[PDB]
């Protein structure tokens, strides 16, 4: 048309030919445990709905043309049991990783991040960095406890980003810091500027960074459709700006997006999620 | 009462005696075409509801008393066919224009802007400026294509204000710029300050400026009740501040407000729309 | 658990032993009169719901541990007639005041503030300050008219904070100012920074300050669940920051919170209200 969008980049016939591969994880488990509501398993469908509709491939405001990228939608990870779904998720992300392609996993609840991280720890033995963008710091199932408990993974390369002190147990903080992980509280992200704060974060995570974006880290005024709606947090613009940085940052080797919940809110929030991926995609179009 | 509001300025018995004339255009057509939902035809009723209720005529925070202005509500433009409704709309705005009064048109979808602009091109032969405040830049029915295609109208005097690169076809940008029109992306409006950016815009539009305000240019966090809800965009305060500037700016000769959709959201969004008009009215009270 | 919250501070067996005492006032009367909707009487229940669930007692982002404070929930003020409910409310707040404890009153509509203020004027004869955080300045039942009309109370120590010129009768302003009270318009609070502006306000109110927080002074984008939803106003973060200041400010001797309305919105808004109290509580933990 007069206005080619994200849909037009899905010209890769074989997954092996796509620069970026989208994987769905339609399962609830995550913040629904810590008070949140059911429904995150519907996130992948809602994301896909707007995926077919949004995001000009040539953005003249940012002046980035992503027309050259190929996207592929590998579908949903489905399994008879939950732990098996975890296994098939990890195995799938790893394969995409192993061949040099970029995996983006749309969820689904926080718990997908554990499989995703292990896929990383296999793909880059001992040289993985991880950032959790999340208003929550829950590490008592608790995906980042699992990763901190990994032999291969160095905690000096783990950042909790935009976490909120009103929602973070002190034992939880203690654990991360005792593992030499870094807490970057919302107030400080906001103090520095989100993108600048996130630059700092990639300095800490370094090579082979897993960019994990819990969307309940955004304020519910912009992002109400999540299992654990946030009173304060990142604005939609900050989110976009951060996704663009991640995309242009060549050490960022995969991304997941957690907690999208269309039962909580079904129109505005899925648009934000697609626009976040969109900005990532634009950023990606700029790397060598 | 102890608190005279906008309703009290409707003391003009004859339209001819009102400084400002309100015209309703209860028709859907506009962004409902480009994905949006039906319902904008209900905007004029919802606007009128809050019109009867809001806006202290003497504002001691801005220290502007609008007590001296007279408003008149000329009602809705109604017609058996749509193109006829367009004709009666243009003809009506022109008459108000022709006699020196100020027309404010409440919609209704974007498409009203075409009739409105032609009313301007008749009233000020060859000396019209136009600003489209809109997160969208759609010019492939497409009201501003129609105006750019006008012999009389000079594109050097056309500004797209607060448009969003994630929602603007590059062919669409190309067309405007190839007509010597100006793109003022959201990011740059926000960079400069909305009012300062809008001052710049009136410098470009100049004499006999048509102030066209698509309300889906505001973020849906403030302005959810529109046909095409915006993830990012102008805040309500920015909108008010911009309407006040327009009002005090003597080259601004008419105004329309598009895309208000009470089926999408019916309480918060109509209040914003009335408050936007309210600020315009205050600004107007300050011109010579 | 790994994450002790506000609930854990309710270890005071006898009210007399609690540093802070929560009193519910489940009555509508207030802004429902001036256009608002019914439902504020449900605020205390909704507040209590989230009270059982939110607010880490040790906040490592602010680095304040409130673990040492004791809270007590004295329940709801209930009465056969409304004026009697007013009497029992005042009498109760006074008793808590008289013994040195800190009363926090959750409403309920604006009208609770009159009883609350009289409780103050009894407890500190002639030496009371009052701040009304409110997008409204309504003083024509009208709780602050009642207090300004008090012999004992000095108007030089009354501040209207974050009031909005689009919603304030000029006779209303005139009355306050003619009583030597101070208007601190939203625009100026925002100009200075909310906390800095509020510091200024406590300078004016001084000793024995009643911190009265109408929650419809926040923008409805953050705080939609109120009887009179605000188009513009304080952000949730500003609210929290202001509540923290109030808490650490030793001249602040009681607090009330008005206009919470779960019939308007029932999940996001009650969370904000509890988080506001939470921040107050943290601030309180810091005073000598
Ligand atoms: Mn999480
Ligand atoms: Mn979270
Ligand atoms: Mn438009
Ligand atoms: Mn638009
Ligand atoms: Mn009030
Ligand atoms: Mn109020």
TrEMBL record, chains A, B, C:
This is Arginase, putative. Disulfide bonds join 31-228. PROSITE patterns: ARGINASE_2 (PS51409). The lineage of its organism: Eukaryota, Discoba, Euglenozoa, Kinetoplastea, Metakinetoplastina. It comes from Trypanosoma cruzi (strain CL Brener). GO terms for biological process: putrescine biosynthetic process from arginine, via agmatine. One of its GO terms (molecular function) is metal ion binding. Gene3D superfamilies: Ureohydrolase domain (3.40.800.10). PANTHER family: ARGINASE/AGMATINASE, GUANIDINO ACID HYDROLASE, MITOCHONDRIAL. Belongs to the arginase family.
